[PDB]
């Protein structure tokens, strides 16, 4: 009996460690004897340790995660794809946590519950990746969402943070209701919620004239929920406001991990299921809309956070092009784009968090940065050029596959749109470089140097961004492996 639970050792450990940290934090934060010490950094270090131990347990027990698969079948499904997805999610959570300590001590954000909520949301996203039934998927999505709602409003006396939370909760709850409605329609039409059963029922028919309008609209509503989650246009406008109004570590965490988890879900639901061309057209139209609107709106922005939010919207458009074309290379390119976008976003938010110690808000606040911190201005410039997709930086991979998918599938309008939006993006990315290197403002802002954690993370992500295309084989192989494991 005990050995059956080897399939959930990683999750058991992280949940138990989260409980231990909750108890530790609440017991000593309330201690008069110890004079109510702030425990955000102490619990943060212990939680980083817990995340790393979870990663060790998961990575080193690759075969064991598939033990007792028949017993666990109606609860979740662990395979090669979920293996690598969960590893990448844990690595992202560890990096995001490591970027938070200067924020904890200098702002004096003393709430250790922040770390606990991050860990519980990580548990939720882990269960999201392995979900193999509509019920499990919904429950894990809701756990993740509720944790985000709470942490988005963590600055509870701030107008901005409270506004972010309110908008997030209302729009999140609305989208979740729409998705749940879709799930109910699919169950009513097919008598099934398990992904295997849905695959068997729906395969071979798609729209064979006598199409289940119940099945067709259930798929549509579920897709609407998914598109809200990935911040695809027109279900996107929550994202810029929430990203700007939340505390910056929250914004960094939301920018990466939920995308990993929800794309895992989207792959395993749609790609593994079957209504077909309709849904790929959904993601097609939403990709084009996201690219255009992200480019234009980002061009309008004068503030750093809003610029990065709109940039992420545009990039999810680029990524969803891969899901749309419905090929093994499409899935592989989508995974490559997520990995690279995640490492670039981690780099960018490490810089943003470093600069938030002097309250960076506007793009113009970067003036004369090439004088006051030359190596920081260069590092940030490499990130921008990578965001623009200039070769041979890592960001060039997404542009290359965008045009690779258009030319082959025959999509000349998509290629047109990609060219235009890439040029617009390059303009608003090099505007930052111009501000740091070319401008001569009358008043300068002198920034405090970053802590060791962010400097090390920045140093590694900056080598990756510059040097990835010298040795890209492991990512290429691992992502081809994952794309294949979805069906075999």
């Amino acid at each position: 009996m005990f050995n059956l639970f080897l399939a959930v050792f990683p999750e058991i450990f992280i949940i138990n460690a989260t409980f231990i940290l909750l108890i530790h934090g609440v017991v000593f934060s309330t201690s008069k004897k110890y004079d109510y010490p702030p425990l955000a950094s102490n619990v943060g270090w212990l939680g980083l340790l817990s995340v790393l131990i979870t990663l060790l347990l998961l990575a080193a027990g690759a075969p064991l995660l598939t033990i007792a698969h028949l017993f666990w079948n109606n609860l979740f499904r662990r395979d090669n794809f979920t293996y690598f997805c969960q590893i990448f999610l844990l690595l992202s959570t560890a990096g995001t946590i490591s970027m938070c300590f200067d924020f904890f001590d200098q702002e004096r954000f003393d709430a250790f519950e922040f770390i606990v909520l991050i860990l519980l949301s990580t548990c939720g996203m882990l269960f999201m990746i392995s979900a193999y039934d509509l019920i499990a998927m919904y429950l894990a999505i809701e756990l993740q969402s509720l944790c985000f709602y709470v942490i988005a409003a963590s600055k509870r006396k701030s107008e901005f943070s409270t506004e972010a939370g309110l908008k997030y909760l209302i729009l999140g709850a609305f989208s979740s209701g729409i998705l749940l409605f879709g799930c109910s329609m699919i169950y009513g039409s097919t008598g099934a919620t398990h992904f295997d059963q849905l695959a068997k029922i729906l395969t071979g028919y798609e729209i064979t004239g006598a199409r289940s309008s119940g099945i067709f609209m259930g798929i549509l509503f579920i897709a609407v929920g998914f598109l809200f989650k990935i911040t695809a246009v027109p279900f996107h406008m929550w994202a810029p406001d929430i990203y700007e109004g939340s505390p910056t570590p929250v914004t960094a965490f939301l920018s990466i991990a939920p995308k990993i988890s929800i794309f895992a879900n989207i792959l395993r639901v749609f790609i593994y299921g079957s209504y077909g061309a309709t849904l790929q057209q959904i993601f097609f139209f939403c990709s084009i809309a996201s690219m255009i609107l992200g480019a234009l709106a980002a061009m309008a922005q004068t503030k750093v956070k809003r610029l990065l939010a709109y940039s992420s919207i545009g990039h999810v458009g680029y990524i969803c092009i891969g899901f749309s074309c419905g090929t093994i290379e499409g899935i592989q390119s989508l995974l490559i784009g997520i990995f690279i976008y995640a490492l670039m976003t981690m780099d960018a938010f490490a810089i943003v968090l470093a600069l938030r110690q002097t309250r960076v808000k506007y793009i113009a606040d970067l003036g004369a940065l090439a004088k006051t911190n030359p190596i920081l201005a260069i590092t940030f410039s490499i990130t921008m050029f990578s965001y623009a997709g200039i070769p041979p930086l890592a960001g060039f991979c997404s542009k290359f596959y965008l045009f690779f998918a258009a030319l082959g599938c025959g999509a000349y309008f998509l290629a047109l749109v990609g060219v235009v939006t890439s040029v617009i993006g390059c303009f608003y990315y090099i505007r930052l470089v111009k501000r740091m290197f070319f401008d001569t403002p009358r008043t300068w802002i002198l920034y405090e140097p970053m802590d060791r954690n962010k400097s090390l993370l920045l140093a590694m992500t900056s080598f990756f961004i510059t040097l990835f295309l010298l040795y890209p084989s492991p990512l290429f192989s691992v992502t081809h492996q994952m794309a294949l494991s979805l069906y075999l």
Binding site: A459, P474, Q481
Partner: protein, 75 residues
């Protein structure tokens, strides 16, 4: 020649220096950290090369199974 150990050691040393520079510290502020970084970089690079070999090995079998499943169509 240019071995994974040497590339990794150079990358680790560069990482420590880049980290010091980002913090506006002298390049060689804590030299024992430079030694630690060279060691970790060498270890990382060697493990990445071995992992790459293993990854290609697994992808080979998996492509083989995909090809067999596809070829079953023409039976």
């Amino acid at each position: 020649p240019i071995s994974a150990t040497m590339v990794g050691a150079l990358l680790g040393l560069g990482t420590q220096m880049y980290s010091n520079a980002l913090r506006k510290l002298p390049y060689m502020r804590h030299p024992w950290e430079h030694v630690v970084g060279m060691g970790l970089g060498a270890v990382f690079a060697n493990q990445l090369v071995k992992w790459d070999v293993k990854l290609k090995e697994d992808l080979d079998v998996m492509l083989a199974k995909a090809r067999a499943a596809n070829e079953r169509r023409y039976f």
